[PDB]
Amino acid sequence: SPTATVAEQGEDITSKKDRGVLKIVKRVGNGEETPMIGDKVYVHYKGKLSNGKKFDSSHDRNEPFVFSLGKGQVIKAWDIGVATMKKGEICHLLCKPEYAYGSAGSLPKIPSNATLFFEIELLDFKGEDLFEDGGIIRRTKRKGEGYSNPNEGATVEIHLEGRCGGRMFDCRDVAFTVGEGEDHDIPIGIDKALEKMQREEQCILYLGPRYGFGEAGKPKFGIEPNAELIYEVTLKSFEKAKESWEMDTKEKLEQAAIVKEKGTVYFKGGKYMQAVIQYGKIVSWLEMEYGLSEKESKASESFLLAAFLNLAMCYLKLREYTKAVECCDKALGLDSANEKGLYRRGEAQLLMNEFESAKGDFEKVLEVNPQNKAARLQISMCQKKAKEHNERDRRIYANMFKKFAEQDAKEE
């Protein structure tokens, strides 16, 4: 009976209009919002053949069927069908073999040229989480074309529309460099998302507090500190930046001078995220080089040493103490008795409560320069903060073993 009902009163949802996918709404649902291309979709379903026999099911509620929409993970009829459903909706689908398994079928279960009946319930749907941190959520409007994606340093041509709490503050066509969106009043989330987009792609981007304008806000757009933003991005065209190995030594040394200066402009203005991107190019280009002339080696090593010391400074400011230490380790591997590298390693290790490692770094600073005032003051600070930390641990341990033993005696 319900197979004949959809065959008679079925809404054709096909572009070519060939009655290949016929739909009937059993349960209405709620919301108005329907799933988009790339969305993670949660469903319950039943599958029947022309004779009425059940071939597949997932209604048990032990586990629903989870997949990505408009990607060819399911039959054509599902990619067309599910895209038309509101949340909580139950529908019926009559699918022709042209939108299902065709002439080959899926033997032994699905025979050749089989018209399939489906009962689908749309449980939930979420947009795609680009960096698995809830920071950048993508909803695709139009699929792009192409082999490549923009890389950091690539030049791009985009159409951009930006909203904050429903209010539009930006609507324009803009040409800029990936990693340097800030030069054109674009937040970092856009630069990060572009690396995952194809030419002619159109999508919606939900930018969380980490990927927007941040704590300072954006006064000219009336954007408050850590406000959530919603953008519409169309990638019109792009020209990729050369990779590290595609550049000769002469070009790497010319560009090192340019991006070091750009990194320093960002640092002076407190744009530490942007300074890291610039100084990081120097490391990428020159760390693994060899076979250089005496003159090329001396200049390459000089750039390399300053880039690690500068990155360590950026990371202390960004409160990323592990990255600060790693940058000082690289600097000290080039220059064993670098005063700046040893002091900065001490500052970062002390901030991570590695009191013994920090003490050692500040001592080696005094071995290099006994005229260092701050170095001696920080050793006493390591001493004072290690004692305070041990008194704290002893208090928590005694309180926890007082708590655990009192709850243990209450049980008995």
Author numbering: 13 to 424
Paper text:
We solved the crystal structure of both the native form of FKBP51 and in complexation with the C90 peptide. The elongated shape of FKBP51 leads to non-uniform crystal packing and therefore anisotropic order and diffraction from our crystals. During x-ray data collection we noticed that the diffraction pattern was quite anisotropic and therefore, decided to truncate the data in an ellipsoidal fashion using diffraction anisotropy server for the complex and the Staraniso software for the native structure. For the native, we used reflections up to 1.88 Å in elliptical shape with 93% completeness (52% completeness with spherical truncation) while standard spherical truncation would have resulted in a 2.45 Å resolution being 100% complete. The native structure has R and Rfree values of 0.198 and 0.247, respectively at the resolution of 1.88 Å (52% spherical completeness) while the complex structure has the R and Rfree values of 0.192 and 0.262, respectively at 2.49 Å (62% spherical completeness). Using secondary-structure matching (SSM) server, we compared the RMSD between our two structures and previously reported structure and found that the RMSD between native and the complex structure was 0.48 Å and the RMSD between native and previously reported structure was 0.49 Å while the RMSD between the complex and reported structure was found to be 0.61 Å for 349 aligned residues. The two native structures are more similar as compared to the complex structure. The structure of native FKBP51 is already reported at a resolution of 2.7 Å33.
FKBP51 is the co-chaperone to Hsp90 and belongs to the immunophilin family initially recognized for its involvement in regulation of steroid hormone receptor activity. Going from the N-terminus to C-terminus, the overall FKBP51 structure contains two mixed beta sheet wrapped around a central helix for FK1 and FK2 domains followed by the TPR domain consisting of three TPR repeats and one additional long helix in the C-terminus. FK1 domain is active as PPIase and known to bind to the FK506 and rapamycin inhibitors or modulators. Inside the cell, the TPR domain of FKBP51 mediates interaction with EEVD C-terminal sequence of Hsp90/Hsp70 molecular chaperones.
